[PDB]
Amino acid sequence: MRECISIHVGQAGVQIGNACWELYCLEHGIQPDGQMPSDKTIGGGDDSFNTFFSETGAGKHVPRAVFVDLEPTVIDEVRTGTYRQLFHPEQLITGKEDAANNYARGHYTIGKEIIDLVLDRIRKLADQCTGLQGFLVFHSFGGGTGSGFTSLLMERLSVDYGKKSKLEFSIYPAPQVSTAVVEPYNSILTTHTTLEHSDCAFMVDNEAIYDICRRNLDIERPTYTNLNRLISQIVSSITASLRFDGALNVDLTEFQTNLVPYPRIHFPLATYAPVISAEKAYHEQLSVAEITNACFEPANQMVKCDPRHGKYMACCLLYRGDVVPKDVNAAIATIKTKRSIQFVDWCPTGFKVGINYQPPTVVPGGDLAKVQRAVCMLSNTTAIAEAWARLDHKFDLMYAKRAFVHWYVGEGMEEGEFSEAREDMAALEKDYEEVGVD
Amino acid sequence: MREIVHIQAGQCGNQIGAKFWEVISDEHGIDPTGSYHGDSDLQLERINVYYNEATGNKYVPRAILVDLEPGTMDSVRSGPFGQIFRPDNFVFGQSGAGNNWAKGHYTEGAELVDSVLDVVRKESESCDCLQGFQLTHSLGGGTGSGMGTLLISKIREEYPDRIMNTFSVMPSPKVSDTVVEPYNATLSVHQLVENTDETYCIDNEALYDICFRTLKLTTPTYGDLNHLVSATMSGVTTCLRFPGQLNADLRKLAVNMVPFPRLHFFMPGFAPLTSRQQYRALTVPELTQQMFDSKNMMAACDPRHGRYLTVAAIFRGRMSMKEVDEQMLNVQNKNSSYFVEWIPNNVKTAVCDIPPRGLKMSATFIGNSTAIQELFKRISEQFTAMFRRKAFLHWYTGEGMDEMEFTEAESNMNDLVSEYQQYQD
Amino acid sequence: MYTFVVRDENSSVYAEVSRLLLATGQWKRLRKDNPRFNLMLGERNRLPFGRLGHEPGLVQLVNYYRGADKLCRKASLVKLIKTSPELSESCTWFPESYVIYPTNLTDEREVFLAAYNRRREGREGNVWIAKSSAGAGILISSEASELLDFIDEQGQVHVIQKYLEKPLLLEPGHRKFDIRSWVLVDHLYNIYLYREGVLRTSSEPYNSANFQDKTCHLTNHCIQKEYSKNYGRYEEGNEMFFEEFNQYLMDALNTTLENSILLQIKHIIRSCLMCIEPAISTKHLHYQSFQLFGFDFMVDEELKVWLIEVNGAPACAQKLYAELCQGIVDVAISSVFPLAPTSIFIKLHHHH
Amino acid sequence: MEVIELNKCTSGQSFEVILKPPSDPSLEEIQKKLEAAEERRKYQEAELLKHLAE
Ligand SMILES: Nc1nc2c(ncn2[C@@H]2O[C@H](COP(=O)(O)OP(=O)(O)OP(=O)(O)O)[C@@H](O)[C@H]2O)c(=O)[nH]1
Ligand SMILES: Nc1ncnc2c1ncn2[C@@H]1O[C@H](COP(=O)(O)OP(=O)(O)CP(=O)(O)O)[C@@H](O)[C@H]1O
Ligand SMILES: Nc1nc2c(ncn2[C@@H]2O[C@H](COP(=O)(O)OP(=O)(O)O)[C@@H](O)[C@H]2O)c(=O)[nH]1
Ligand SMILES: NC(=O)c1ccnc(NC2CC=CC2)c1
Ligand SMILES: [Ca+2]
Ligand SMILES: [Ca+2]
Ligand SMILES: [Ca+2]
Ligand SMILES: [Mg+2]
Ligand SMILES: [Mg+2]
Ligand SMILES: [Mg+2]
């Protein structure tokens, strides 16, 4: 057994982490006080769920997580919420004033004065791990803390934990659920200094989660609560292999090995289905073929893009519920003969499939309905580069006029670090075109 | 705990700040003696932002009353909510400023500035975490303009990384005390350009035309004009004073609104603006259409004469947020020729479930528009009209100023006009 | 008030569509860089499809199907037909074609020579044509050495396809011609065929014993008006429309344009478009697509219709700009952004 | 169409299917970038005070 440390940075990171550990508990049958009846080994054990939870002599199963925010408002909810008893005060780090959606403020100004503290709190979790695998870092692209402080934490983690893997869960900025305007700057800044330090990054576009909540769950104007309970389902399905018995994606290394043939292109697209409104009378349960065929509609992609006009480099199918291999192969065959699935000539045209029998767990009173089977497809397509193009274009519209640059310079950043980051992105967009276009 | 320090200076500064503390005090359920009597917890959520918590659950506004003559501040103390302010926070002289910027900034005001800062410092030291300052004042007089800017110049020196937002009343010849107001105004503008982060520009003429033309008041008064500023000041602070999916402090608010350091002058607006047909329910379309109407704005500037850099809108009341998004997206997509196309998503919206006193729903408008150059152009025209003959300068040279400093203030704002011009094309 | 932007200043088709949209008083034009638009008249090459459909509340519509280049590129169409089971390599309406890359750069050079040597041995008509998308540059020859030596002297992808040695010749004149059919596809993937086509004819008598002079072999409207000496003799602008052409078919061969030609064309347009539907459809996409197509056909002396190429950014005949452009607005633009007949199109129903 | 590496346990199973075969900054440097930005803040704040001093 090998442990995995989760880190949550910024507002988005902390709330999404809250929605995830709430879900993990409902899946592993762990109650709000940390007790687990089905766990028969008290105070210890090397089970699969122990990769995310440690155990105390009293029987409490405590997450291996560290929440970090430069202002205490969002983390205070965690300190007084339903699952307050899980964590201890060490795991919750709060500053006094945030980074004002300013990358320079979260990286240089405020970050410099709290980094050594965060590391010490992470070292305290690492010392408990007999064989630490790596870290899972949740944050946002637009937030001054999620962007500015994450890139610094990553640079230092690559120094104190060299051989450890680092996976990202990044929130792509979407105007519908944002009141800020400088988010393109932060996103392109944080991706520039983090690229070499992240082994695999899953980007969720709020715009996508938004329309999935309005279209499938009939939410007219969704809250962050709605957006997070859904994003926690995807994350739960992407990490279930690490927490449950299995053989596919059993440690963080197998993510890069399975999904990232080229290092810089470590951004897999995620697709999930079904997503059914609980308020619904009663839905016709979709079969394996139907839910699998849905994994190729742009409607249930975490980032809106067109894979048909890109090339795949890898492809994982994670199933949860009543699913058997026979039905998986049948669906797969029928889809190749109807879809546009162009693989890169230097990669095998195939699919790695995992099946966990336990069906998706749903939050009581949440928006999602209980289904008998569900799937999550991770696919590395050059089509996700559309995302960067959108973002890189906005960056160009503002930077051409040097708008808002003073706020960043004023925190100690140099104006050259913009163009340097921007030219890095242009190189990333170029690597995506070299790999998928003819 | 993100506390704000309020400063009001001079006759206009205090009468506006006065009513302001009167309007938000009612919204937060604080009576004229400092006792809470509301029915909702949302009133106390962000209450420590503008109020200090004293003994016995008493809430004392965190405001500093400043003036060079005792008249106005006596009025506030005997006013309706006068007993709520801290007796120590009254810092006033006796000579007066004589509607002279020089006296407020160099001679008279200078003799009282240290003592005013001693109170500012006393309030800040108790702030668990200070967000920043806000000043109410006029620019055409002597105290709020002369000493007001003097205070800002000294607050940026002692608090260099704190936000300084101001509500500044600009002088118009139509609502004029003295002929030297363009002098006092031009001088204060350079200080705000240099040391303030956000300056809400309020033109008395616009306030007048709104009371006379729209509200249908045959003979308006500074009191009528201050009602509009009270309701507006309440609006642009609803974000800070009440909860919601916003969650932002002064520095974060300015980051998403000021793309260039010296161009931090906004045009506020309010809606509805109805004359006494006042009980008619107002729809979300009507609310939005007026909010963008120039006649609903208080800078006496036509927005269609310039372009918008950024726009913030705060909606108050129990309405359909789905219907708010639809309507806001409608105004943008119906007049996208007056927004700059090089700042994506430069129009944001926030909702607040608590409406102002006596309104089902309302909107508050914050426009960072290049059209504001028309304001500084009028002021510069009226300034040169007199400085070219050296008219009325003796009031200032007699207080120690030189013609050179005036010539500089002249060029300082002409630059401010050239800056606003290169971005309108 | 709908809004649109114009990114292609050279498009004569959508230059009138824009003029019509503005004449409606309900469509406002924006600068070519403003993203807050409803309709986009995009550029030909490198159109930024990735940036469409991300403006809250705005429903966006573009005039190019992403991936249609697979059908409008010389080397792309050939590869599409041979590899697509729906069309198969045994397609009977598409000239036996081969994709040839210059030797200075897969490639069907050897496969071409095999079918070339089989014909030369069987005394069959062995005259081929070489062409590419990078042309205004075409070479017709019956010797395999010239064709291959001509492509090596270039540097882009070429295609060698059989030259129709027995084309249908009009009278009087004894001249060649091609057919242009405009097919509009809306967002719902309905295939509307323009009731009005055109025939770009040659004003020179056909001569099969001299492929060196290419004025009587090529029917491009620019070649006839430059290198041909009988331009405008028989018809105006070397263009005969479906009324005069239908009357000639009934007088000479005792048949109609509907039964003799239009049926096949309607079949080709359907098979070509149904083939790539699952690849370019914007049915569940965050934006919507539509596109006008300019199919070019050939007619032999046995009244069999062959496919030459498909134009993704085609032009229209001077006499039909008004009727066609108006229809574009009725079924392609107003069908998504309604305003406040006898359709000029022929709907080709199919299974989606 | 081939199924390889079929693994089974009590909570599920996983396998692979093939349709077609193919054809850092050290700790020293980080402190420098950080302190360099702090130095540019101290100098930019100094110029403000020097301006106010004047
Ligand atoms: N999906 C999702 N997105 C969020 C959530 N919270 C914030 N965001 C997104 O994050 C972006 C802004 O970043 P924040 O996380 O709020 O900023 P921060 O990390 O707290 O950093 P500061 O600027 O210092 O406050 C916006 O675009 C939001 O849409 C959340 O709970 N769920
Ligand atoms: N296999 C073939 N048999 C007979 N004629 C052919 C032919 N291929 C091409 N042509 C002639 O060439 C002309 C079309 O050339 P092609 O379409 O390849 O070039 P192009 O694309 O620049 C013209 P356009 O785009 O306007 O249709 C037709 O007029 C036709 O007469
Ligand atoms: N809106 C408004 N404007 C005022 C008020 N009092 C003064 N003014 C304006 O401010 C200018 C005079 O400045 P004043 O307030 O007397 O400066 P002081 O010396 O600090 O008191 C004139 O242009 C007036 O129009 C007021 O109560 N409301
Ligand atoms: N001083 C400001 O710039 C300011 C103050 C209060 N609200 C603002 N805008 C709202 C738009 C949506 C959320 C915040 C801006
Ligand atoms: Ca155990
Ligand atoms: Ca590393
Ligand atoms: Ca004195
Ligand atoms: Mg925050
Ligand atoms: Mg006065
Ligand atoms: Mg062509």
Side-chain angles (χ1 to χ4, degrees), chain A, chain B residues 1-245 248-425, chain C, chain D:
Chain A
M1 187 276 307
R2 303 185 65 183
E3 303 83 351
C4 300
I5 290 180
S6 297
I7 305 176
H8 310 280
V9 186
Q11 177 175 123
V14 168
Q15 291 174 183
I16 292 182
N18 232 28
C20 292
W21 293 96
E22 182 193 23
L23 184 46
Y24 297 173
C25 285
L26 295 180
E27 298 179 343
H28 300 293
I30 298 177
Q31 301 165 2
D33 49 327
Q35 299 301 327
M36 185 174 177
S38 63
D39 182 351
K40 310 305 177 181
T41 48
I42 300 302
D46 56 358
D47 292 323
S48 294
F49 66 94
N50 282 129
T51 60
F52 280 57
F53 297 79
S54 58
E55 305 177 33
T56 72
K60 179 182 295 182
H61 305 61
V62 173
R64 306 186 184 272
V66 164
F67 298 67
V68 184
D69 199 1
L70 300 182
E71 137 228 13
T73 68
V74 181
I75 287 179
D76 272 335
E77 303 264 18
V78 178
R79 291 187 179 104
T80 57
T82 305
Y83 293 99
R84 60 188 176 273
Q85 300 194 81
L86 295 184
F87 317 90
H88 39 262
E90 281 81 10
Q91 303 175 263
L92 313 185
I93 304 182
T94 42
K96 286 225 172 174
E97 63 180 348
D98 61 58
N101 290 346
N102 185 328
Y103 172 89
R105 185 171 183 80
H107 187 93
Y108 300 90
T109 297
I110 293 179
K112 176 177 175 294
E113 301 291 1
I114 186 180
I115 181 60
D116 291 313
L117 164 67
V118 181
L119 309 188
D120 198 70
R121 301 295 174 82
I122 294 173
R123 176 69 60 196
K124 293 179 185 174
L125 289 189
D127 288 0
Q128 288 191 89
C129 306
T130 57
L132 173 65
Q133 304 180 11
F135 307 97
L136 311 182
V137 182
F138 307 78
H139 66 96
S140 69
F141 272 10
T145 292
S147 68
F149 181 70
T150 294
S151 59
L152 178 73
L153 178 55
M154 298 282 290
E155 288 175 328
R156 286 287 288 267
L157 285 182
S158 305
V159 178
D160 299 2
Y161 310 97
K163 314 309 176 62
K164 278 66 173 56
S165 306
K166 286 178 286 301
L167 281 64
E168 282 186 66
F169 286 97
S170 307
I171 310 289
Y172 192 91
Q176 269 167 330
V177 300
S178 170
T179 40
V181 177
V182 301
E183 287 186 292
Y185 285 167
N186 300 333
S187 301
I188 286 186
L189 288 175
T190 188
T191 288
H192 171 44
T193 62
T194 313
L195 203 63
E196 285 295 78
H197 299 286
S198 192
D199 295 299
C200 186
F202 301 105
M203 286 195 299
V204 176
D205 183 350
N206 272 345
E207 163 178 307
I209 307 303
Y210 194 78
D211 286 326
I212 299 180
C213 288
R214 294 204 308 179
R215 219 191 306 107
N216 297 29
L217 305 173
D218 296 333
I219 309 296
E220 312 210 59
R221 214 302 185 173
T223 68
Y224 281 139
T225 301
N226 307 123
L227 301 174
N228 292 339
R229 289 228 172 98
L230 176 64
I231 300 179
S232 55
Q233 286 296 334
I234 285 71
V235 180
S236 181
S237 306
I238 295 183
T239 62
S241 49
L242 300 173
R243 303 176 281 109
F244 290 90
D245 198 7
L248 161 73
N249 290 344
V250 66
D251 67 3
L252 297 174
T253 302
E254 202 162 1
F255 276 91
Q256 174 270 314
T257 278
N258 281 341
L259 297 179
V260 180
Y262 275 55
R264 276 175 66 98
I265 313 296
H266 57 251
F267 301 96
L269 174 68
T271 299
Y272 193 87
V275 177
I276 299 301
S277 171
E279 298 287 331
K280 229 186 176 304
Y282 233 70
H283 199 69
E284 325 81 9
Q285 282 306 308
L286 305 192
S287 75
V288 185
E290 285 168 347
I291 80 177
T292 303
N293 181 22
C295 294
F296 292 90
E297 297 294 348
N300 31 247
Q301 305 179 354
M302 303 303 82
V303 181
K304 282 186 181 176
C305 55
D306 200 332
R308 306 171 297 172
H309 294 105
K311 282 195 174 191
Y312 291 73
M313 288 161 292
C315 209
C316 263
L317 285 185
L318 314 176
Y319 290 93
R320 304 187 63 175
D322 187 47
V323 180
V324 299
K326 181 179 57 184
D327 295 354
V328 184
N329 300 328
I332 298 185
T334 293
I335 297 185
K336 275 296 301 179
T337 69
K338 266 182 168 54
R339 295 283 185 168
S340 295
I341 304 172
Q342 278 288 329
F343 267 80
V344 296
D345 299 311
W346 48 275
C347 289
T349 311
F351 305 87
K352 293 188 173 65
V353 180
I355 296 172
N356 184 273
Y357 290 151
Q358 176 178 321
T361 300
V362 296
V363 180
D367 302 307
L368 296 193
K370 179 73 176 184
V371 301
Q372 260 311 328
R373 64 189 57 81
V375 68
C376 180
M377 194 187 87
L378 314 186
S379 46
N380 199 337
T381 359
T382 64
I384 215 168
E386 303 173 19
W388 306 117
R390 299 159 45 194
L391 209 59
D392 281 314
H393 182 49
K394 292 180 174 177
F395 184 107
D396 286 353
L397 276 177
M398 287 185 287
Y399 194 69
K401 309 291 186 304
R402 291 311 188 267
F404 303 91
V405 182
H406 59 280
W407 289 103
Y408 294 80
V409 178
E411 299 296 353
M413 204 171 70
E414 312 194 64
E415 190 181 80
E417 177 165 355
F418 278 88
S419 66
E420 193 191 271
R422 184 55 178 93
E423 295 181 15
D424 190 3
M425 299 300 303
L428 191 69
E429 267 176 295
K430 192 171 180 179
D431 296 335
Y432 267 94
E433 196 178 5
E434 292 186 7
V435 180
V437 187
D438 304 356
Chain B
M1 322 176 195
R2 40 184 61 159
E3 297 82 21
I4 298 178
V5 173
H6 170 90
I7 305 176
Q8 52 189 67
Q11 183 175 12
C12 183
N14 275 274
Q15 285 177 165
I16 269 176
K19 302 295 292 185
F20 168 79
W21 285 105
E22 183 178 347
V23 181
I24 71 179
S25 301
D26 169 83
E27 290 180 10
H28 291 283
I30 308 303
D31 62 357
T33 57
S35 301
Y36 170 81
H37 290 283
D39 66 335
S40 186
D41 307 323
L42 294 76
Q43 288 173 306
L44 297 184
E45 187 80 31
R46 313 255 256 183
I47 191 68
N48 64 1
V49 175
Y50 285 96
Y51 290 81
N52 274 315
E53 193 169 339
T55 309
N57 209 19
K58 286 280 190 176
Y59 292 97
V60 186
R62 196 181 299 104
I64 308 180
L65 297 76
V66 181
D67 196 351
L68 286 178
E69 59 189 5
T72 296
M73 288 176 56
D74 277 346
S75 297
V76 183
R77 194 180 301 112
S78 290
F81 277 76
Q83 310 299 328
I84 197 184
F85 298 106
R86 206 180 188 270
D88 306 325
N89 293 27
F90 289 83
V91 189
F92 51 102
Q94 296 276 341
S95 61
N99 280 275
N100 185 328
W101 193 86
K103 296 191 178 196
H105 199 87
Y106 287 124
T107 63
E108 306 300 341
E111 184 175 356
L112 191 73
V113 74
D114 287 3
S115 50
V116 168
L117 294 179
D118 285 354
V119 182
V120 167
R121 187 181 313 97
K122 179 272 181 186
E123 289 290 16
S124 298
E125 292 168 340
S126 68
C127 288
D128 181 20
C129 190
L130 185 69
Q131 266 191 88
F133 311 90
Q134 64 175 33
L135 184 78
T136 55
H137 70 154
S138 69
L139 303 192
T143 296
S145 184
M147 184 175 181
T149 55
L150 182 61
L151 288 178
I152 293 160
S153 185
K154 292 197 182 299
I155 293 184
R156 189 169 175 178
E157 190 179 17
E158 190 173 342
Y159 305 92
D161 74 330
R162 293 299 101 182
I163 290 292
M164 173 75 66
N165 309 143
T166 66
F167 300 88
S168 303
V169 179
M170 316 300 175
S172 174
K174 319 307 176 60
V175 205
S176 179
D177 288 350
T178 64
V179 290
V180 301
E181 295 169 355
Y183 280 165
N184 303 333
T186 291
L187 292 162
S188 295
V189 171
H190 182 65
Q191 309 307 310
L192 311 160
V193 172
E194 247 198 18
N195 298 312
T196 69
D197 307 305
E198 295 181 322
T199 295
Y200 296 75
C201 301
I202 310 163
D203 187 317
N204 271 343
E205 184 180 22
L207 299 180
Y208 185 99
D209 284 328
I210 287 179
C211 298
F212 180 85
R213 290 192 202 162
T214 297
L215 292 174
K216 300 303 180 185
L217 302 189
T218 305
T219 309
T221 66
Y222 285 114
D224 299 319
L225 282 49
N226 296 348
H227 179 63
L228 294 178
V229 182
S230 309
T232 302
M233 291 181 63
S234 172
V236 311
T237 57
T238 293
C239 159
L240 308 179
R241 298 189 287 102
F242 293 105
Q245 281 199 357
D249 69 72
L250 290 176
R251 179 188 279 102
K252 174 181 291 171
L253 251 343
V255 166
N256 293 318
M257 284 276 312
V258 188
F260 306 98
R262 290 176 295 283
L263 310 185
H264 58 274
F265 299 92
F266 303 162
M267 307 189 325
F270 190 87
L273 301 170
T274 310
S275 53
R276 295 184 171 98
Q277 290 299 336
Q278 39 184 144
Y279 319 97
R280 170 185 176 179
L282 203 45
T283 58
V284 175
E286 297 174 319
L287 242 183
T288 310
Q289 297 179 288
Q290 301 177 205
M291 176 183 55
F292 284 104
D293 188 357
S294 71
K295 301 196 301 294
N296 282 60
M297 303 187 186
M298 302 159 183
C301 292
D302 191 352
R304 307 174 86 102
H305 284 172
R307 312 191 71 198
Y308 286 103
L309 301 157
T310 49
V311 181
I314 306 79
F315 286 77
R316 308 191 57 175
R318 307 182 61 260
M319 60 195 63
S320 172
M321 192 172 302
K322 164 192 173 64
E323 204 174 53
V324 178
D325 292 334
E326 297 182 343
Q327 289 299 318
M328 282 301 299
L329 303 180
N330 180 281
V331 183
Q332 309 176 62
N333 309 331
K334 295 189 64 59
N335 312 276
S336 65
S337 53
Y338 301 110
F339 304 79
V340 298
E341 69 285 8
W342 36 271
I343 302 191
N345 314 119
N346 58 340
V347 180
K348 291 305 175 180
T349 307
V351 171
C352 186
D353 304 294
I354 303 173
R357 184 58 92 106
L359 291 193
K360 286 297 188 62
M361 54 180 56
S362 72
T364 305
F365 178 98
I366 312 168
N368 187 350
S369 155
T370 76
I372 200 65
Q373 58 166 323
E374 293 186 343
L375 190 162
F376 305 112
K377 281 185 179 178
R378 288 187 300 254
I379 305 301
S380 192
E381 278 189 352
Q382 304 160 9
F383 176 105
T384 302
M386 302 188 305
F387 183 76
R388 64 186 182 187
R389 301 295 285 268
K390 290 178 182 174
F392 306 101
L393 284 180
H394 68 81
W395 301 119
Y396 298 82
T397 73
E399 298 299 318
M401 290 180 72
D402 183 68
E403 302 185 355
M404 184 64 68
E405 174 164 342
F406 281 67
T407 292
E408 293 184 352
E410 189 172 43
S411 307
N412 283 326
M413 199 172 58
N414 279 332
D415 294 0
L416 194 68
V417 186
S418 302
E419 193 166 359
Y420 273 130
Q421 189 56 36
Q422 50 176 125
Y423 291 109
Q424 179 178 318
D425 311 324
Chain C
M1 183 70 64
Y2 301 115
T3 61
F4 68 95
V5 302
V6 175
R7 300 179 63 90
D8 190 6
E9 302 287 339
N10 301 326
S11 188
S12 53
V13 175
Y14 300 92
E16 175 71 351
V17 175
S18 175
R19 195 281 294 184
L20 284 179
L21 295 172
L22 294 178
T24 61
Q26 313 176 51
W27 278 88
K28 181 168 176 289
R29 172 169 179 180
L30 315 174
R31 304 187 210 84
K32 55 200 314 172
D33 297 323
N34 190 327
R36 285 206 184 279
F37 56 80
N38 282 128
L39 177 61
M40 161 181 291
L41 315 186
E43 52 269 284
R44 303 181 187 88
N45 306 119
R46 306 195 60 81
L47 187 161
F49 288 94
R51 307 206 299 252
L52 297 176
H54 299 273
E55 280 292 352
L58 282 184
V59 177
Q60 297 178 331
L61 187 69
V62 58
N63 70 335
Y64 281 99
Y65 262 96
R66 193 189 187 190
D69 59 319
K70 263 60 181 182
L71 202 80
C72 304
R73 245 67 178 183
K74 299 295 188 303
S76 302
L77 169 60
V78 182
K79 176 192 170 186
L80 176 66
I81 295 177
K82 294 187 173 183
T83 56
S84 322
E86 300 75 22
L87 314 183
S88 75
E89 185 189 60
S90 57
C91 169
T92 68
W93 45 258
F94 186 77
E96 180 184 356
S97 305
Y98 299 93
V99 177
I100 300 295
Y101 289 86
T103 53
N104 56 273
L105 277 58
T106 56
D107 188 74
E108 294 175 332
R109 262 183 180 268
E110 291 190 344
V111 183
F112 161 75
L113 303 180
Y116 177 88
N117 293 333
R118 173 186 292 182
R119 280 183 168 269
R120 167 176 292 182
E121 179 189 14
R123 303 289 103 100
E124 296 183 356
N126 205 10
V127 173
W128 298 77
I129 180 181
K131 52 184 181 179
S132 62
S133 296
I138 290 77
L139 171 62
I140 315 173
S141 180
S142 59
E143 300 298 343
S145 54
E146 300 182 9
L147 299 179
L148 298 177
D149 284 334
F150 171 82
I151 298 180
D152 300 327
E153 301 164 357
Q154 302 300 359
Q156 56 283 344
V157 187
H158 274 68
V159 298
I160 298 179
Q161 68 176 178
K162 186 69 185 61
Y163 188 98
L164 296 171
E165 303 184 12
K166 299 179 173 181
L168 176 51
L169 302 174
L170 306 180
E171 302 293 347
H174 205 78
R175 47 213 177 100
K176 192 179 182 179
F177 77 98
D178 71 324
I179 298 177
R180 164 63 68 81
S181 301
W182 291 273
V183 178
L184 172 57
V185 184
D186 63 5
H187 58 294
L188 293 179
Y189 215 88
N190 302 337
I191 309 175
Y192 301 106
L193 174 59
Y194 191 8
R195 77 152 82 98
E196 294 302 349
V198 305
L199 290 68
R200 297 165 295 184
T201 65
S202 173
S203 55
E204 300 297 355
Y206 182 88
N207 188 89
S208 59
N210 177 24
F211 305 100
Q212 185 177 358
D213 186 359
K214 303 175 298 179
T215 297
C216 62
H217 294 280
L218 290 65
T219 67
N220 291 325
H221 187 275
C222 60
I223 296 181
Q224 298 299 331
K225 195 176 182 182
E226 273 289 5
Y227 303 98
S228 187
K229 305 187 177 185
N230 284 323
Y231 181 89
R233 180 182 183 181
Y234 310 91
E235 38 279 348
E236 186 173 0
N238 288 18
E239 297 182 355
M240 181 181 302
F241 295 82
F242 277 7
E243 184 171 2
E244 182 179 4
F245 184 62
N246 186 87
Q247 183 67 210
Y248 172 87
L249 293 179
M250 294 188 298
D251 294 323
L253 292 305
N254 190 23
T255 193
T256 67
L257 174 60
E258 176 64 28
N259 301 14
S260 55
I261 301 181
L262 210 59
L263 275 188
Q264 303 183 48
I265 294 188
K266 289 192 291 185
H267 169 64
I268 303 173
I269 304 164
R270 267 189 64 198
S271 295
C272 292
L273 291 166
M274 293 188 56
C275 168
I276 63 178
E277 182 186 5
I280 63 169
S281 184
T282 67
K283 187 175 182 175
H284 318 279
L285 218 50
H286 38 284
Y287 66 102
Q288 293 293 347
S289 301
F290 77 94
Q291 180 169 1
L292 183 64
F293 290 97
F295 287 70
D296 294 336
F297 299 89
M298 277 281 298
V299 180
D300 61 327
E301 66 178 36
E302 296 285 295
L303 289 184
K304 180 179 176 179
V305 181
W306 301 78
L307 179 60
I308 298 308
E309 84 150 7
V310 192
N311 294 272
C316 184
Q318 173 63 357
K319 188 182 66 175
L320 300 177
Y321 271 106
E323 190 176 10
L324 178 55
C325 288
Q326 175 58 50
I328 291 181
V329 186
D330 294 2
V331 305
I333 291 173
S334 296
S335 63
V336 189
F337 310 94
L339 297 175
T342 303
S343 184
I344 77 169
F345 293 79
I346 314 174
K347 183 183 177 181
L348 315 183
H349 293 95
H350 64 281
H351 300 183
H352 311 278
Chain D
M1 199 67 175
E2 184 183 359
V3 156
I4 72 184
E5 287 184 347
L6 182 60
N7 303 125
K8 300 178 69 180
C9 61
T10 293
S11 63
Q13 49 183 334
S14 58
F15 58 91
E16 185 177 22
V17 49
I18 314 181
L19 305 174
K20 181 200 308 177
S23 300
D24 285 333
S26 65
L27 197 58
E28 168 195 20
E29 298 140 1
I30 294 179
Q31 284 285 320
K32 293 184 179 172
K33 293 174 183 174
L34 291 166
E35 295 177 346
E38 185 180 43
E39 218 58 19
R40 286 188 295 280
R41 277 190 307 274
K42 291 181 180 177
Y43 178 83
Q44 293 161 17
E45 177 159 311
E47 289 306 335
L48 175 64
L49 299 184
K50 188 201 300 293
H51 196 61
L52 289 183
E54 296 169 328

